[PDB]
């Protein structure tokens with residue numbers, strides 16, 4: 001029974017998805033997030049080996065001691081909703097707010113964060129899960145540990161090698177082949193969103209707002225950024241999906257060398 | 272220049 005086992009606190013966020021609250025598991029005072037997903041706005045459903053949101057299937061698949069992805073601790077069904085209990089880092093800030101407050105990130109910091117996001121996304125893909133909504137709003141920073149956590153699997157799918165013709169993630173992080181053709185492959189679309197994310201980190205906002213910008217093929221740098229970083233970004237944002245790097249090629253890029261440890265990142269940049 | 276969130280969908 002949900003209401004007996006968690007003490008509900010303040011609302012943390014709400015939107016199309018539903019509403020998420022701060023909570024504490026009464027058992028051991030563990031910080032949690034309590035996410036209410038209305039059944040009306042659930043598009044994709046799966047089956048665990050009952051009928052659940054696809055979000056729950058994907059979360060169960062990536063669930064692990066690895067801290068780069070949010071851990072689903074439990075879930076409950078109600079008449080008109082599902083309630084998802086997620087681990088909550090404390091103290092925490094999302095990457096959207098962090099970038100808004102701090103502006104364009106130093107490259108050392110962006111390298112550490114981007115590397116951690118890569119490792120998180122590789123974890124998802126290794127577990128058979130395509131996220132489909134990689135963005136700064138869907139990344140939490142454990143401020144004490146300097147560890148990033150990928151959240152919000154509400155637009156995800158099972159990973160496959162064929163074309164996707166559906167998409168409900170964030171349009172400004174979506175690739176030109178989706179904008180033009182309503183078609184994309186999972187990995188190359190993911191790399192496109194990672195390009196957008198990296199630009200966002202080093203310039204302080206995303207490069208494109210409009211469809212014509214997304215398909216136009218020009219990346220203008222509004223901030224002073226190293227040539228090596230520009231090169232990686234522009235590779236991730238190649239118009240042709242087959243011109244984009246693999247995850248291996250990203251992590252082997254010269255800009256990606258000599259990453260800080262999470263603990264070093266916290267000490268130098270967060271504490 | 273205005274930075275904003277972009278809801279999914």
Ligand SMILES: Cn1c2c(c3ccc(Cl)cc31)[C@@H](C#N)C1(CCNCC1)NC2=O
Nearest residue numbers: 012013020033035088089137138151152
């Ligand atoms: C503040 N917050 C939010 C989310 C959180 C998940 C865990 C924790 Cl610790 C905090 C969270 C997401 C949800 N629901 C999303 C869901 C929508 N996209 C951003 C993340 N919304 C949040 O507001």
Ligand SMILES: [Cl-]
Nearest residue numbers: 035151152153
């Ligand atoms: Cl979430």
